[PDB]
């Protein structure tokens, strides 16, 4: 007991060797990590034109999870069940009637940029969900304007991976809802109304708003300290 | 001896039975001991006078 004597370290300048603390802020990160972080910083500053700045404001948590909950019902089949459907069709084609009595009309969410754009132009799309992280932004930068012109409700959602998850693909750039059952018309209409309350009604004001242009960090702290006096 | 010839000698032939033996002279070791003790004493009295 008396031999257990405290031996503290001052850790002052020139007193003792500094402890091994976290140095992640001053780490010389490799090129790709440095590039992606600097790219995020440059996008956050360097004021963005309204066409691109209309992104970065996606659906809220409740609306997004409700959209995906109603989206997960209309999944566009898989390989296994397609093979089962083909086998059933082959069995029925022997003696039974045609597809008018064996396989019903498909009910699934649409996908594919060209197909979705064509559906929007043809007014057959009831809802359009656009990914917010399309690396070439020109693929979808015209989609909100096209939907507004054609009267199609449109919402911007995050995680193109999440959009492709319901399609069973790695990434889906845009999803379109065209046909649904009769019982879920009310909930789909509520989703459309909530979507229009944020995107369609604010299209005119979003066309006149520029994003970015924020310095942040030391510059903002110095400006705040200068404005305090 | 040449640098390689020291490897064949026994341990006690390459040193002196003392602290820092074979690396520092006796006078150097004595000076370091006295200097260390006196400065540690100076630190102690500095802390005591501060308190």
């Amino acid at each position: 007991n008396p031999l257990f004597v405290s031996r503290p370290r001052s850790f002052g300048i020139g007193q003792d060797i500094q402890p091994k603390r976290d140095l992640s802020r001053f780490v010389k990160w490799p090129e790709y990590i440095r590039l992606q972080r600097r790219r995020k910083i440059l996008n956050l500053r360097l004021k963005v034109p309204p066409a691109i700045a209309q992104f970065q404001k996606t659906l809220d948590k409740n609306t997004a999870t409700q959209v995906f909950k109603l989206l997960n019902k209309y999944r566009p089949e898989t390989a296994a069940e397609k093979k089962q459907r083909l086998v059933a069709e082959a069995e029925a084609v022997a003696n039974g009637k045609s597809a008018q009595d064996v396989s019903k009309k498909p009910y699934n969410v649409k996908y594919g940029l060209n197909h979705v754009v064509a559906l929007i132009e043809a007014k057959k799309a009831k809802l359009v969900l656009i990914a917010s992280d399309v690396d070439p932004i020109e693929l979808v930068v015209f989609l909100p304007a096209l939907c507004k012109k054609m009267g199609v409700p449109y919402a911007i959602v995050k995680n193109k991976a999440r959009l492709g998850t319901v399609i069973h693909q790695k990434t889906a750039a845009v999803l379109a809802v065209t046909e649904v059952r009769e019982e879920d018309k009310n909930e789909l209409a509520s989703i459309v109304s909530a979507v229009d309350a944020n995107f369609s009604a604010k299209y005119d004001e979003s066309r006149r708003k520029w994003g970015g242009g924020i310095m942040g960090g030391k510059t903002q702290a110095l400006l705040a300290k200068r404005a305090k006096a | 001896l040449r640098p390689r010839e020291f490897a064949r000698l026994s341990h006690n032939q390459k040193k002196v039975q003392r602290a820092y033996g074979g690396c520092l002279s006796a006078n150097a070791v004595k000076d370091r001991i006295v200097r260390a003790f006196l400065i540690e004493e100076q630190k102690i009295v500095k802390q005591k006078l501060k308190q």
Partner: protein, 118 residues
């Protein structure tokens, strides 16, 4: 994700070995430099005979790419004699010769007679 050093280093990976789907060579080559491909022929010059009679050392003409380790093994495998020391020489004509001294229990003269170059 706490880093105590300011330098970034590549993390270690699995680094699995090779599992070829086919052997590049169909048949493995027969072992080059066998015992018959280590010894060429004995040397029966006057100096070689003096070495055999007076020193119990056999003088052999060995290939240029043989070493004392393989010369000892080939001599043991061909003539069933255990050498004690081997000296290697390269003649000005581009060929290697080996002085192979035998132990006391072995007589180079009888070994030479058994070979048949005497």
């Amino acid at each position: 994700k706490v880093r105590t050093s300011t330098t970034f280093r590549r993390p270690k990976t699995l680094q699995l070995s090779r599992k070829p789907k086919y052997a590049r060579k169909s048949v493995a080559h027969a072992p080059r430099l066998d015992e018959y491909k280590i010894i060429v022929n004995p040397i029966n010059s006057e100096s070689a005979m003096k070495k055999i009679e007076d020193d119990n050392t056999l003088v052999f003409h060995v290939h240029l790419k043989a070493n004392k380790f393989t010369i000892k093994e080939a001599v043991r495998k061909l003539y069933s004699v255990e050498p004690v020391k081997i000296n290697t020489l390269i003649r000005p004509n581009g060929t290697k010769k080996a002085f192979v001294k035998l132990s006391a229990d072995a007589d180079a003269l009888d070994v030479a007679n058994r070979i048949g170059f005497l």
